[PDB]
Amino acid sequence: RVSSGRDVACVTEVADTLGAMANQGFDFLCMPIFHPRFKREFYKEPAKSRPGPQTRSDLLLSGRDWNTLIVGKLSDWIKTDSEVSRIRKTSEAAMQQELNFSAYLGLPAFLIPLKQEDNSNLSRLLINHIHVGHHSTMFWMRVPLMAPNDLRDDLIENEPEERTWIWWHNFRSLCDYNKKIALAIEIGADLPSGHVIDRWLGEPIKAAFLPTSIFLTNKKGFPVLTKVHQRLIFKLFKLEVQFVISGSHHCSYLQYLEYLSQNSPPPGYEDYLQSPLQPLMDNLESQTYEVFEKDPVKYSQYQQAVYKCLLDRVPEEEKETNIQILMVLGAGRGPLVNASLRAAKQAERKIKVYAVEKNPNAVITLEGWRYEEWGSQVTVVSGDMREWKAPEKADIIVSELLGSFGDNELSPECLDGAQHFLKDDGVSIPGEYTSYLAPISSSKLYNEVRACREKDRDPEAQFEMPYVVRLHNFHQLSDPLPCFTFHHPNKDDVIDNNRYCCLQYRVDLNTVLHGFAGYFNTVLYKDVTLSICPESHSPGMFSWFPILFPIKQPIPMREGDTVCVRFWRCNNGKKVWYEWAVTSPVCSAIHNPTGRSYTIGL
Amino acid sequence: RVSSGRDVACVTEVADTLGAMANQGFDFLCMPIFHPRFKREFYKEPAKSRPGPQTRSDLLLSGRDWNTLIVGKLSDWIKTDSEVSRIRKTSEAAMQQELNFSAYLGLPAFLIPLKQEDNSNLSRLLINHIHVGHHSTMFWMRVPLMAPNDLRDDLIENEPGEERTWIWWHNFRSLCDYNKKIALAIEIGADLPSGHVIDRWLGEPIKAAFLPTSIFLTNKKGFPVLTKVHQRLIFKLFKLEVQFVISGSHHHSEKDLCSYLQYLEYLSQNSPPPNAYEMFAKGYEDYLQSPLQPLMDNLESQTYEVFEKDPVKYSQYQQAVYKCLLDRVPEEEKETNIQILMVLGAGRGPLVNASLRAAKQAERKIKVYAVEKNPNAVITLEGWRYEEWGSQVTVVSGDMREWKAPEKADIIVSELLGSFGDNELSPECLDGAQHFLKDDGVSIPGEYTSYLAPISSSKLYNEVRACREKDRDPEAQFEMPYVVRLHNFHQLSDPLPCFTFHHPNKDDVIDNNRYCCLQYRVDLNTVLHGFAGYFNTVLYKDVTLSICPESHSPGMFSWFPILFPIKQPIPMREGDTVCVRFWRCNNGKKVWYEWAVTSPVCSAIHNPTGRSYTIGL
Numbered sequence A: 001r002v003s004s005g006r007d008v009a010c011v012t013e014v015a016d017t018l019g020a021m022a023n024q025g026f027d028f029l030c031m032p033i034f035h036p037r038f039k040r041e042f043y044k045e046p047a048k049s050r051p052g053p054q055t056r057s058d059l060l061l062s063g064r065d066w067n068t069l070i071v072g073k074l075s076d077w078i079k080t081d082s083e084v085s086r087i088r089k090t091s092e093a094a095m096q097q098e099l100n101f102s103a104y105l106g107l108p109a110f111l112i113p114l115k116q117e118d119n120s121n122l123s124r125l126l127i128n129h130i131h132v133g134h135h136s137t138m139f140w141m142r143v144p145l146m147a148p149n150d151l152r153d154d155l156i157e158n159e160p161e162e163r164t165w166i167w168w169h170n171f172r173s174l175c176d177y178n179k180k181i182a183l184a185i186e187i188g189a190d191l192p193s194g195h196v197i198d199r200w201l202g203e204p205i206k207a208a209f210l211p212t213s214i215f216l217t218n219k220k221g222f223p224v225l226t227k228v229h230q231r232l233i234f235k236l237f238k239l240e241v242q243f244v245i246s247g248s249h250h251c252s253y254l255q256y257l258e259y260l261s262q263n264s265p266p267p268g269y270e271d272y273l274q275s276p277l278q279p280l281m282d283n284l285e286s287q288t289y290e291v292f293e294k295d296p297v298k299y300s301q302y303q304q305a306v307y308k309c310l311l312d313r314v315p316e317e318e319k320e321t322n323i324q325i326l327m328v329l330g331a332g333r334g335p336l337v338n339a340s341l342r343a344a345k346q347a348e349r350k351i352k353v354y355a356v357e358k359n360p361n362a363v364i365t366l367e368g369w370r371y372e373e374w375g376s377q378v379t380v381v382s383g384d385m386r387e388w389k390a391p392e393k394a395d396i397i398v399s400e401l402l403g404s405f406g407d408n409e410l411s412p413e414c415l416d417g418a419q420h421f422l423k424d425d426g427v428s429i430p431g432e433y434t435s436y437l438a439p440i441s442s443s444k445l446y447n448e449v450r451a452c453r454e455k456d457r458d459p460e461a462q463f464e465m466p467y468v469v470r471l472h473n474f475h476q477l478s479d480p481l482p483c484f485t486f487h488h489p490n491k492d493d494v495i496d497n498n499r500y501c502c503l504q505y506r507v508d509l510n511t512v513l514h515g516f517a518g519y520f521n522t523v524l525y526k527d528v529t530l531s532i533c534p535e536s537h538s539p540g541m542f543s544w545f546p547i548l549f550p551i552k553q554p555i556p557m558r559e560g561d562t563v564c565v566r567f568w569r570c571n572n573g574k575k576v577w578y579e580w581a582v583t584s585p586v587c588s589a590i591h592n593p594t595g596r597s598y599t600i601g602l
Numbered sequence B: 001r002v003s004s005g006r007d008v009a010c011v012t013e014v015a016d017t018l019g020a021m022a023n024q025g026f027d028f029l030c031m032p033i034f035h036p037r038f039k040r041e042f043y044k045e046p047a048k049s050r051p052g053p054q055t056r057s058d059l060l061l062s063g064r065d066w067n068t069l070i071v072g073k074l075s076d077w078i079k080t081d082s083e084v085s086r087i088r089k090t091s092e093a094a095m096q097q098e099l100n101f102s103a104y105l106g107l108p109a110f111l112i113p114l115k116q117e118d119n120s121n122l123s124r125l126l127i128n129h130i131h132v133g134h135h136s137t138m139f140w141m142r143v144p145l146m147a148p149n150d151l152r153d154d155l156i157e158n159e160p161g162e163e164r165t166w167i168w169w170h171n172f173r174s175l176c177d178y179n180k181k182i183a184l185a186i187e188i189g190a191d192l193p194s195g196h197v198i199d200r201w202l203g204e205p206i207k208a209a210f211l212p213t214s215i216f217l218t219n220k221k222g223f224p225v226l227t228k229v230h231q232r233l234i235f236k237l238f239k240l241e242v243q244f245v246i247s248g249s250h251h252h253s254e255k256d257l258c259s260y261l262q263y264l265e266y267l268s269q270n271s272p273p274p275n276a277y278e279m280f281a282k283g284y285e286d287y288l289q290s291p292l293q294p295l296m297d298n299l300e301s302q303t304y305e306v307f308e309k310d311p312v313k314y315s316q317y318q319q320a321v322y323k324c325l326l327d328r329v330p331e332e333e334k335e336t337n338i339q340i341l342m343v344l345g346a347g348r349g350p351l352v353n354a355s356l357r358a359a360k361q362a363e364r365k366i367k368v369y370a371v372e373k374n375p376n377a378v379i380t381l382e383g384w385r386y387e388e389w390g391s392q393v394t395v396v397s398g399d400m401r402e403w404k405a406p407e408k409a410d411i412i413v414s415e416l417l418g419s420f421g422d423n424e425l426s427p428e429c430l431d432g433a434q435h436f437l438k439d440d441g442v443s444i445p446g447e448y449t450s451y452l453a454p455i456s457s458s459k460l461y462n463e464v465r466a467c468r469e470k471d472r473d474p475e476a477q478f479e480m481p482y483v484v485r486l487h488n489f490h491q492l493s494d495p496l497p498c499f500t501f502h503h504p505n506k507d508d509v510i511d512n513n514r515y516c517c518l519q520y521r522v523d524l525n526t527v528l529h530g531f532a533g534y535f536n537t538v539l540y541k542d543v544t545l546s547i548c549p550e551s552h553s554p555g556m557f558s559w560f561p562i563l564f565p566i567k568q569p570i571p572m573r574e575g576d577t578v579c580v581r582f583w584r585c586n587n588g589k590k591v592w593y594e595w596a597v598t599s600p601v602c603s604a605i606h607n608p609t610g611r612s613y614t615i616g617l
């Protein structure tokens, strides 16, 4: 509901200003804890021996107020990266002094502006302050979307976009992507391109500063922003960031912000990052199935597949004399079986149903429909499809053992064991599925994986295992290439699910390789498909999240380079895992060798 | 003694071939454990159901003979990186078969040749076999210094650069994550690459060198003789103490195989005498230790003995006192002027004696104060005191920063210099000892300056990477300096002056907190692994000591260089610039360094707040 704050240059009376901005509709206040003009000496007499208080004490406000209402502001005269040695020293002392005072008050946030590209010494002092005890203080980095020198007016006759991004990137990289360090963007009269904007939005923005001078005066003397500025506020709305109003009153600009909200264009697993589920190794929970059974697209296509499958193997003269044997391999809690029954009667054709399941907890749900809805036509079998002896061969087998990478849930291994009781002319649904790989760049997802270090194991094990991610959390560097492919029923001379391939991609830009995004598509029956590939309008695009294969050493690359990735799929009879390595432009180490970090049961 | 082996193409009778090559002078035999022509099927009948043994039994030799005399050879028909799926799948099964059997025999080493650039699938199969328990078997990767296509005779009309095979080995070892069980077995051809290329080869863990019988020239007497080009390569291999392997038929000369071994023994006893080497020998060659802290810790007597082994430091310091005396007391004050000299950090003696003899050489009278904080060293100091020196030398036990001198000094002499100059906290010690120095007093050394240079060393990096200790930050090893050697790394640019300290420091407010940005231009395509640290110092006027790379001042063998590693190695192109931010911090209780790379790629600040490395007091 639009949380807003007020940025002031100087406060003559704290108690009065707080109530004044409260009546305006502001939630918090960005104020300096030291007077912005009150410069001080630390080394040279007699200015060093200056008597009196350094600033107003902590007893002006309650502890509750300092922790909720006040956002501290660093003095602007402090320049920790000044080329002047004396000034650099003084700033270092002043930097530590104000950082320590902000933590003493228990401030929730502290503003530190970046006014140049070189903020090396600042980052050094900041991460030092964070490491030395003091905590629970978020650090908002005031960084303008455009440099002040790029927004000035062309008034100098002898001196007539990616700039400020380097300011933030270099500082954050130097600070090793510390969690206590967020971003506070400042919006100028001119905005960067749409792509650059989206890149800023990927950064942990906690506040957005709105200068009072970027607002236009309407016909009735009311503040108004351009559509260019408006679209940015719309993107900032769905990030739930706070807005800070800075500048002179010449103050209910919040009305226009609420106006832009109440009437905002319509559209939370976006941050979500965990390891892929293993239905074959683990008995899923009822709450887990419900998520899978919450997508109608998967239900529709699986119904349309069985629909067309019957129509292509039994004519009208056998419409009631031919009874097909349909087996639901991995029935789950019902939906797949009900989809077949809703497909058989849709185009009148008689079927004999066998519903198998290894999960006993799901069998109970299956045997609920068995004696309340389905009947005797649907036979319930409790066990593994690879060890169960069927007393009758099947015309059709329907299964949904597909993961984010297609075969990562060991669909091939399962269907290969259930292939023996399939008729010679039998049709398997799905018929085939293909995994895809695409080189990506995500400093966000990398540091997110980097923080997944667990004790009592390999400190780098988190980099040698796949993760289920989201599309917008990374920038795809090249179009996905087909990785592995499995088709059922497998009429190969011998069934070997061990695979290997070398995929190459062309680097068009200058970026950093952080890993590989994994997608997949499948063919249930002819014409009926399910796909999650990016550039594909095929249905099922919201049925699976993309997978991510991280890399240990991020690879900075120039444009004109090539990325060859070696990818293995291994099967030692007990476990199935993936091994991967980069061989261009530089050779990395083979990730997850012998499944030392990641394996999939059976 | 030169250990050597024999590479055979095939063996009919094993017991016969062993005794045959044993009397030739060999110490081991490089033979295949499976017949090189015995290509086998695994996935298709009727060839799949092949009866009989796959190869000869293990009962032919004892365990002792298998463990010490035999180096297994992988079959050449096994091509696990063929673009044909049927060939690859067959080779993969064949690869695992011979590997598991070689480990079953307890073989000390196993030969696997690299014949192309793409050995990705080979790496996967190899590091697997190492990880499934079977170890203790060294893996000799046979890689020729020159590609077979580059050594063939130009005999084709329609089909008429030397770092080609280096990529074969480098890509393979990198894919194998620089595994400890994987070594290099170079194969020497008729043509040799550049000397710098060779020097890069020798940096790798070479365990063996293959000497074909076809590279030997037949002398006018009929004896096998190597060319002078090859002889220099053999000489370099001698000091690496690698083993030599003779491959091919001895019927290229009029003599037998033993003559090839006698020639190598001949070159060994006629090999050039090593100097500019042997300092480190034998050796501090792979020296990777943390810098000693004589201030936070009391050195052992053995440790002092090492520092006192360099006559250069003794001479230069003696020369410094020599010149300093003559400059501050004239000839007419040859006996009426007694110079008050103080040896701050006397150690076991040397600096005190070097000052006494410098007084006799200059014919000047000095009153000596020998101060030391190490109680154990003071015991040694009071030995010289009550046997040799006398009452002219006053031995003081304590810290120079806390000691209250009852008499100001004309000259203070100290040797608190580390590999990086100030890494042993020489400034802090002298600053706290500056007060009892006269207003016109001279400090030895008068000044010193540290230097930094961007380097490349996959060798040193992986050594640091293995320095992960339990119960601490798993990346802490990359955030601390190491004392290393020059030949273990390749400098990418000339070193720049880092921090400078002069004594006595006459600044207004004495601060040892330092910061600088050093920029270097890259002229090659290489990988940044860290920064080398050197230092130079001025004892007295014109009398200096330095360990800087291209320094003409003495002291090049007085200190090993230091290394500041990096967490994420940076692959760089030529034309790129390398800006490094370097900090020296002093919080009153600890002193440490913080460094970060801001070009071409912006890294993170290493050792922030001295979380991984500090220096006492």
Ligand SMILES: Nc1ncnc2c1ncn2[C@@H]1O[C@H](CSCC[C@H](N)C(=O)O)[C@@H](O)[C@H]1O
Residues within 6 Å of the ligand: A279, A280, A284, A292, A329, A330, A331, A332, A356, A357, A358, A359, A362, A383, A384, A385, A386, A400, A401, A402, A403, A409, A414
């Ligand atoms: N070998 C086997 N035998 C019997 N049932 C199996 C099996 N392997 C898997 N299953 C069943 O098949 C079901 C797979 S549910 C898979 C959901 C899918 N990955 C999605 O994201 O939508 C599970 O309920 C499991 O119990």
Ligand SMILES: Nc1ncnc2c1ncn2[C@@H]1O[C@H](CSCC[C@H](N)C(=O)O)[C@@H](O)[C@H]1O
Residues within 6 Å of the ligand: B294, B295, B299, B307, B344, B345, B346, B347, B371, B372, B373, B374, B377, B398, B399, B400, B401, B415, B416, B417, B418, B424, B429
């Ligand atoms: N503050 C202090 N007070 C007194 N003695 C000190 C001191 N700091 C160091 N010393 C002494 O000075 C000696 C320095 S030995 C240094 C060896 C030199 N870095 C080299 O590698 O060649 C030590 O024996 C130590 O005991």
